Design an enzyme around this catalytic site. Structure first.
Site, PDB file in Angstrom:
ATOM      1  N   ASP B  11     -54.580 -36.195   3.009  1.00  0.00           N
ATOM      2  CA  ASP B  11     -53.625 -36.641   3.091  1.00  0.00           C
ATOM      3  C   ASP B  11     -53.498 -38.244   3.856  1.00  0.00           C
ATOM      4  O   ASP B  11     -55.104 -38.789   2.754  1.00  0.00           O
ATOM      5  CB  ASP B  11     -52.873 -36.319   3.982  1.00  0.00           C
ATOM      6  CG  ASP B  11     -53.909 -36.573   5.959  1.00  0.00           C
ATOM      7  OD1 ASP B  11     -54.158 -37.670   5.549  1.00  0.00           O
ATOM      8  OD2 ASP B  11     -52.804 -36.622   7.345  1.00  0.00           O
ATOM      9  N   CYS B  71     -58.422 -35.338   6.728  1.00  0.00           N
ATOM     10  CA  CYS B  71     -57.467 -36.246   6.909  1.00  0.00           C
ATOM     11  C   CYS B  71     -58.263 -37.090   8.284  1.00  0.00           C
ATOM     12  O   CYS B  71     -59.117 -37.324   8.514  1.00  0.00           O
ATOM     13  CB  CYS B  71     -56.798 -35.557   7.532  1.00  0.00           C
ATOM     14  SG  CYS B  71     -56.895 -33.435   8.333  1.00  0.00           S
ATOM     15  N   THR B  73     -58.526 -36.313  11.487  1.00  0.00           N
ATOM     16  CA  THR B  73     -59.795 -35.144  12.437  1.00  0.00           C
ATOM     17  C   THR B  73     -60.250 -34.592  11.859  1.00  0.00           C
ATOM     18  O   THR B  73     -61.186 -33.772  12.539  1.00  0.00           O
ATOM     19  CB  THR B  73     -58.739 -35.180  13.426  1.00  0.00           C
ATOM     20  OG1 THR B  73     -58.087 -34.119  12.897  1.00  0.00           O
ATOM     21  CG2 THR B  73     -57.910 -35.780  14.390  1.00  0.00           C
ATOM     22  N   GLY B  74     -59.585 -34.060  10.011  1.00  0.00           N
ATOM     23  CA  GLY B  74     -59.858 -32.529   9.874  1.00  0.00           C
ATOM     24  C   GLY B  74     -59.872 -31.258  10.420  1.00  0.00           C
ATOM     25  O   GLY B  74     -59.821 -29.952  10.119  1.00  0.00           O
ATOM     26  N   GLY B  76     -56.036 -30.539  11.015  1.00  0.00           N
ATOM     27  CA  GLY B  76     -54.534 -29.942  10.771  1.00  0.00           C
ATOM     28  C   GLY B  76     -55.047 -29.420   9.326  1.00  0.00           C
ATOM     29  O   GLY B  76     -54.643 -28.748   8.989  1.00  0.00           O
ATOM     30  N   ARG B 115     -60.957 -40.410  10.637  1.00  0.00           N
ATOM     31  CA  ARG B 115     -61.342 -40.764  12.514  1.00  0.00           C
ATOM     32  C   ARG B 115     -62.298 -40.688  13.163  1.00  0.00           C
ATOM     33  O   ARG B 115     -62.280 -41.867  14.329  1.00  0.00           O
ATOM     34  CB  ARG B 115     -59.582 -41.278  12.641  1.00  0.00           C
ATOM     35  CG  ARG B 115     -58.559 -41.784  11.888  1.00  0.00           C
ATOM     36  CD  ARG B 115     -57.040 -41.299  12.118  1.00  0.00           C
ATOM     37  NE  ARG B 115     -55.890 -42.172  11.572  1.00  0.00           N
ATOM     38  CZ  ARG B 115     -54.807 -41.390  10.930  1.00  0.00           C
ATOM     39  NH1 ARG B 115     -54.440 -40.400  11.811  1.00  0.00           N
ATOM     40  NH2 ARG B 115     -54.368 -42.741  10.687  1.00  0.00           N
TER      41      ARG B 115
END
Ligand SMILES: [Cl-]
Ligand SMILES: [Cl-]
Lengths: 158, 158
Positions: B11, B71, B73-74, B76, B115
């Site tokens: 994303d 994404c 945090t990985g 989702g 992140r």
């Protein structure tokens, strides 16, 4: 914050951390009850998916609010729990991810890997996890909704 | 080892790591092709579940062998990919877990959190991931089979 009902589950690779975590959380005012689905001994070789599915089903069926799951890496239990309709499960070993698992993903299930994380870090993360509560009116809710939309494709026949 | 077909997806929170990872893996002899399902710009606000489901469906439909997903945090993307029948997805940020994701879980999908992890660690882990290949005759296969057994409960009607 109101206390939450928890289920806890492990396979044979996660027994000692499960016991330590259970002891750690049994004195916590944010926990109303702990339902332990097992295993309760390293001698029990029951495969992780059964225990993960049983604990995830407790959430689906309104018997608990969240589940903490432990196996060697925390990966197998997370995969398994995500197969249950309406259940969202993560493996998380850092404070930022554990926060977002709740506040972004509304994930009812948190998983740890006994073979990869240390017990004091795991205890700390589990305690923090309880302090966050998902906001159903947040922008993240529209993202979670797309996961729920996809789950509408399937009917449980067996 | 024969090369594998990969899908890659992110994303808006995972764009720069996705580009770096794609560049890193485009010279790797264990990768036969990379199918990028997007997003391709931080301006694209498409929610992570759509991109994760699209990339996971490429595996289900025999168009790629594995998917790498990024994404914030990985978490989702991993949750979303696990909703696809026969797809097993993990978030992993350490070398032991990445190995076991393949050798224990037969997980076709690996996810990273831009992140929370650093880019050189992510590149390193992605390279190692390609070197492991699941053994269908291993004892782990009987555990993976229990996940597949549970998935037999559901029929896709829509
Ligand atoms: Cl941390
Ligand atoms: Cl590592």
């Amino acid at each position: 914050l109101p206390p939450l009902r928890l289920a806890i589950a492990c396979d044979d690779a996660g027994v000692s951390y499960k016991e330590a975590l259970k002891a750690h959380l049994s004195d916590n005012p944010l926990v109303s009850s702990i339902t332990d689905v097992g295993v309760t001994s390293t001698t029990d070789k029951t495969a992780y998916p059964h225990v993960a599915i049983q604990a995830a089903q407790l959430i689906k069926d309104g018997k608990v609010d969240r589940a903490l799951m432990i196996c060697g890496t925390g990966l197998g239990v997370a995969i398994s729990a995500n197969k249950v309709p309406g259940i969202r499960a993560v493996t998380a070993h850092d404070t930022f991810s554990v926060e977002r698992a709740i506040l972004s993903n509304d994930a009812q299930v948190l998983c740890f890997g006994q073979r990869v994380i240390g017990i004091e870090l795991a205890k700390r993360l589990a305690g923090e996890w309880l302090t966050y509560r998902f906001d159903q009116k947040s922008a993240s809710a529209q993202k979670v909704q797309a996961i729920s939309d996809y789950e509408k494709k399937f009917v449980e026949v067996n």
